[PDB]
């Protein structure tokens, strides 16, 4: 996030880090319950990647995180790799997340929910703070 | 050139499709929602993370970080997967698995 600010630690407890087997962060995601993470289709997640829940400081080796293996990847078959439309993938975890002070789920809307233009919302992540 | 160690956040407004199309034109498709152009920008490493708004007191997933300015410009709209257009697929997938 460019020109954002540091989150209060643990205050976005659905935010996960998607990492390869060496620990390299390549995408974010959101817990929607204890067994499922929703992320973007273009992230290209596979069952060799891992979901890291409970993280704040990726450079702290002492933080108490949950490293969760992925059992199955469900990319939306309508993802359009030319137009980027329908850019959503679900990850079924092989072991449940354990919900806690720092790990829990975001709510999902109904399909008919209307969020008005101009509403102040929030986005979070470990992406670049400068291009 | 490297990512921050510590989780970042940004407040930002949702944009109407009409105002989003003033920059991106026909690249905005029916399962996309725009937000930002407000002095902040999602950037490489943020993809797949949340765009949340409050609904009845609880944070609700409205977008998934997807694409935008190729230099993460803070004055152009960020584009997010529109969860309301995709949540029926989400629920069907959970119910079948």
């Amino acid at each position: 996030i460019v020109n954002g600010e540091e989150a209060v630690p643990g205050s976005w407890p659905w935010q996960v880090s998607l990492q390869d087997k060496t620990g390299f962060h390549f995408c974010g995601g959101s817990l929607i319950n204890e067994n499922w993470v929703v992320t973007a289709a273009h992230c290209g997640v596979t069952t060799s990647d891992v979901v890291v829940a409970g993280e704040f400081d990726q450079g702290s080796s002492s933080e108490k995180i949950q490293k969760l293996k992925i059992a199955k990847v469900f990319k939306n078959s309508k993802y359009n790799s030319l137009t980027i439309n329908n850019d959503i993938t679900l990850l079924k975890l092989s072991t449940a997340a354990s919900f806690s002070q720092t790990v829990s789920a975001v709510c999902l809307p109904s399909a008919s929910d209307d969020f008005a233009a101009g509403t102040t919302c929030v986005t979070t992540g470990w992406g670049l703070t400068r291009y | 050139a490297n990512t921050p160690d510590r989780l970042q956040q940004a407040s930002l407004p949702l944009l109407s499709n009409t105002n989003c199309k003033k920059y991106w034109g026909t690249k905005i498709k029916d399962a996309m929602i725009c937000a930002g152009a407000s002095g902040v920008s999602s950037c490489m490493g943020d993809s797949g993370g949340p765009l949340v708004c409050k609904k009845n007191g609880a944070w609700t997933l409205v977008g998934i970080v997807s694409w935008g300015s190729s230099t993460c410009s803070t004055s152009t709209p960020g584009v997010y997967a529109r969860v309301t257009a995709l949540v029926n697929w989400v629920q069907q997938t959970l119910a079948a698995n």
């Binding site: 209060v8 630690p9 829990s104 975001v106 709510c107 102040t120 | 609880a58």
Partner: peptide, 12 residues
């Protein structure tokens, strides 16, 4: 869902 145990603090 959607209610963090640690409340977020946003600038603005």
């Amino acid at each position: 869902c959607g209610v963090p145990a640690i409340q977020p603090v946003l600038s603005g």
